[PDB]
Design a protein around this nucleic acid. Structure first.
Lengths: 92, 99, 78, 91, 92, 100, 79, 89
DNA sequence: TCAATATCCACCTGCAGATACTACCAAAAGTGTATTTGGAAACTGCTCCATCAAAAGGCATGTTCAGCTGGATTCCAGCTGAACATGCCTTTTGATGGAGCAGTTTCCAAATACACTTTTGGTAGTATCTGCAGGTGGATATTGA
DNA sequence: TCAATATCCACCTGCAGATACTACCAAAAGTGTATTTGGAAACTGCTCCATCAAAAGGCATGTTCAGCTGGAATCCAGCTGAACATGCCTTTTGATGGAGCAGTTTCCAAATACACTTTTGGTAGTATCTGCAGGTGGATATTGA
């Protein structure tokens, strides 16, 4: 009945730091982190489509929201990653 | 048969993100590539923070991450602190700073 | 009482964690007042969120939503 | 000395500094003034959340305010410093 | 093609201050004022229904949002006015 | 037979309904929400306009301008709290000098 | 000329006086210019994003208003 | 006298920075984000930006002169502008 | 400079709580397939309102001075911290019932669709009329004495 | 206190830029009537966890003293504001484009529904292992000498 992001956080952790664990209090913080950024990005993407009279949210709205929210080099790398993901999703 | 996270090359879920976007009253329609982009972004940010936190844990000679380490990571970084400046980490403490 | 249970040593510890070397004797009442002000604002918003739903128990999510309103997002409980 | 050892010890830690029963008692007393005179129950994680938030608020305020003692050439914390910090923050 | 709240602002003004006019720059400020409060109240009402797993926005959500946003005596009077409006709307 | 008349209002109930429906706030919208919200908006509008007209009268004028709105807002304890993160074009500041 | 030395001493003195300031140090005129440049960079960066999204080459007032509203600053008199 | 100028400038509402310098600066900043393209600017957009900037600066000066007096001074220093920004966030 | 006392720092031991792992399962959530539909891209085109130059006069620039303020020094009394001996209030633990949460009915309220009437936004061409600028007359505070 | 000079208020006149008032219109939108549907309220029951008690001892409280610091008074030199003469940059105006905004078409990507795998969350049960506390044991600065 309850759902979370813990599985995927654990995978990513074993992918960057294979020797390192994580406590239960900390994964709550990480789950809260993921829920917050989702809400922010989707909220900005909702408005851009309303401002421009669009009824559909696409990857362009998410990209623009990423540019607006995230600071500096972090936005640059996030844009690169998302673009690659879409690129190799389409080519399958 | 095949998932969409695998086509995209990701660990995060692309179906769940789609579901949450549709059920959140964000817009009438939702495209195919939006969940992929968003999941990739979330994965990138998680990995960044976890890397920094594991480094902080190792410096303190520990094998396990706790909120103290995430706080140190976040406040020692000039960008994550700006993204998370209105945020308080439970059981995280403060940075040592005298004067 | 009930505001005098926030003791002189507790306030002194909170000050030291903030890097304070010396502390006037009038800081103990001022801190008590500002704390009492902070709790009132959060608690009424929590109680409002709690009454909209028709229940008589304050949950952690009500507190989290209240703080999020005040602009004080909290990680750890939801 | 003694102040420097204590400062170093306390910045290195994470635990809560106010005792729990007094904070609980005060929060309940404040709640009862709303609610139209009836006593609500509280989950425990709720009181811990509120306590964490409050102590964070106070520590950060003390930090912001000891910057105004040194601005004025002092070492001792006074109440005018806290008042002015709250004013400038916008609270 | 463009729409605004100027008509109703002018009516209310002639209802409180019959001798007094209003300039065009000021009515822009008032129109901006009305659009802002609408967005805030409706945004809070959207979340309360999501938090509690409801698919409908009612007068109770608006009332709670009013209590949360507005400070003190102003919320009290706003609640009174809205309640009267609904009461005499239903009785017709 | 209009909805604003049935309710005793000057503000538009139908328009508020349409704007709630089109804004992606929820999948459904009830019938009392537009009237309740329109009434709240009318109350606040009139509350501001009263003080602005009073300020104009004090300045010996018959027409409201943004300066008057600013004075009204900043001299009232609650409206300032509501509108404290807002700047009003062509409004200026409140006079304030202080001794050292 | 550097396009920020067009923000002159008298203008800064006037803003300070409207703020209630009696005396001003000679080092305030360069500090203010940096503050202003930072503010403008932050607002304009977001304004340009909103209009490039819409596939325009013209910055409107709504783009500026949206940017400010993001930054935590809400401006009424425009539309 | 400083006292007459303060009183006069607090009754007024007009803008204090001249238009063309502000426009030039704002267009100089824009071209760095547009990758060489000279974007056009509505006339009602530059006025918006100017109103906002002047408000920001006036309120900052107020907050800082609050800190000059705290220190026992009458003269405004950069020392005092920097600290107000830190405390505001 | 000397140094015992804290004090720091490291190192080793034991164990208790909390982590990680395996198996079951089942349900609910995501994937694949085919159909239909509607939003948005692509291409035209027209009128608005943005940009580019020019002419001049009003605000800014530069120099000097003198009066005011910032900053360092000295002195003294108030007030904070540290230490020590009491004891009172917090913490931990355990039986108990009240309230949250899930499941079932149903019924009242909202969405969908068509016709018809009302309202609001924009333009043309007015006509006031309110507020600002300049002009003049009467009256006081502060500059210096 | 004297007093002229700005300066302060007040009144007046003139005018012109902006607000109210009509017409009109016609396009968009809101209202009224039936019909169907499903979301949420009302009722019942259950079990989880939150209130409420009673012991133990560890942190808080009170008194006193010594020394550190805040605050007031001098004094000196740096530096900011005010005034005046001058000239350069901003403001205003008129003329073209070019880009925004409205219109038409169509096609591609989204919703919709149904059947089929799969993955994730929860529950026993296992065990294991990381780190915290304790204590030994080596070795450094420190404020009183």
């Amino acid at each position: 009945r309850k759902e979370s992001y813990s599985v995927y956080v654990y995978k990513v952790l074993k992918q960057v730091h294979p020797d390192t664990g994580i406590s239960s209090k900390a994964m709550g913080i990480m789950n809260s982190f993921v829920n917050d950024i989702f809400e922010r990005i989707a909220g900005e993407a909702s408005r851009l489509a309303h401002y421009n009279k669009r009824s559909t949210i696409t990857s362009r709205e998410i990209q623009t929201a990423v540019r607006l929210l995230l600071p500096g080099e972090l936005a640059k790398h996030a844009v690169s990653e998302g673009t690659k993901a879409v690129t190799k999703y389409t080519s399958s | 048969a095949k998932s969409r996270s695998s086509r995209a090359g990701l660990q995060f879920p692309v179906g769940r993100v789609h579901r949450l976007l549709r059920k959140g009253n964000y817009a009438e329609r939702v495209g195919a590539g939006a969940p992929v982009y968003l999941a990739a972004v979330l994965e990138y940010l998680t990995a960044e923070i976890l890397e920094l936190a594991g480094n902080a844990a190792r410096d303190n000679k520990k094998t396990r991450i706790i909120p103290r380490h995430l706080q140190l990571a976040i406040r020692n970084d000039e960008e994550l602190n700006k993204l998370l400046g209105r945020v308080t980490i439970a059981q995280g403490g403060v940075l040592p700073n005298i004067q | 009482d009930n505001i005098q249970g926030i003791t002189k040593p507790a306030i002194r510890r909170l000050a030291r964690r903030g890097g304070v070397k010396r502390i006037s004797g009038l800081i103990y009442e001022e801190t008590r007042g500002v704390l009492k002000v902070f709790l009132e604002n959060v608690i009424r918003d929590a109680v409002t969120y709690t009454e909209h739903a028709k229940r008589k128990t304050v949950t952690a999510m009500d507190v989290v939503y209240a703080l999020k309103r005040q602009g004080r997002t909290l990680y750890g409980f939801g | 000395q003694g102040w420097l050892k204590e400062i170093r010890k306390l910045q290195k830690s994470t635990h809560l500094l106010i005792r729990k029963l007094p904070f609980s008692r005060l929060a309940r007393e404040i709640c009862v003034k709303f609610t139209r005179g009836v006593d609500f129950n509280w989950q425990a994680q709720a009181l811990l959340a509120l306590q964490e938030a409050a102590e964070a608020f106070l520590v950060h305020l003390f930090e912001d305010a000891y910057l105004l003692t040194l601005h004025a050439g002092r070492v001792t914390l006074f109440p005018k410093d806290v008042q002015l910090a709250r004013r400038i923050r916008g609270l």
